Amino acid sequence: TEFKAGSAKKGATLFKTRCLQCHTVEKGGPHKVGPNLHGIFGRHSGQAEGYSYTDANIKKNVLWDENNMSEYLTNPKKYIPGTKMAFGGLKKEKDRNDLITYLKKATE
Ligand code: HEC
Numbered sequence: 244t245e246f247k248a249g250s251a252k253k254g255a256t257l258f259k260t261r262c263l264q265c266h267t268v269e270k271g272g273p274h275k276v277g278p279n280l281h282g283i284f285g286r287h288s289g290q291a292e293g294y295s296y297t298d299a300n301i302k303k304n305v306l307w308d309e310n311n312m313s314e315y316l317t318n319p320k321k322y323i324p325g326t327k328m329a330f331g332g333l334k335k336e337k338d339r340n341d342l343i344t345y346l347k348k349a350t351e
């Protein structure tokens with residue numbers, strides 16, 4: 244909502260020690276505890292190339308956009324009840340703002 248542009252060398256440090264544990268930022272790493280995120284921008288929820296999703300994440304079909312990605316990041320359990328992502332949710336919007344720029348740079 245109060246988005247502010249970041250830089251690749253900042254968002255990566257966070258994602259690499261917060262999201263890396265289960266996910267993959269590029270398309271060379273096999274699907275770990277979480278699906279591949281490389282190319283989600285512009286697609287609906289539940290579209291990983293070779294990985295299954297929950298009954299609630301599919302029915303949800305959220306169009307992963309710049310602001311929308313934060314909507315779910317703040318609380319995955321509240322938006323998608325029953326989802327496998329048990330990461331906790333990064334409540335601080337200023338902190339996600341920079342994270343979006345990094346992923347955004349990797350997808351486009
Ligand atoms: C492992 C415990 C996880 C951590 C840490 C993070 N995520 Fe996650 N995420 C995980 C799973 C297993 C799933 C699928 C949920 C299901 O029930 O099927 C997800 C999904 C997402 C998605 C949506 C993918 C899609 O719908 O195609 C996004 C955009 C996403 N996760 C982002 C994300 C970020 C940026 C994280 C760090 C803050 C993060 N996840 C950590 C498991 C895990």
Ligand SMILES: Nc1ccc(O)cc1
Nearest residue numbers: 284285307308309347
């Ligand atoms: N629609 C959209 C949103 C965010 C991105 O990083 C790319 C494309």
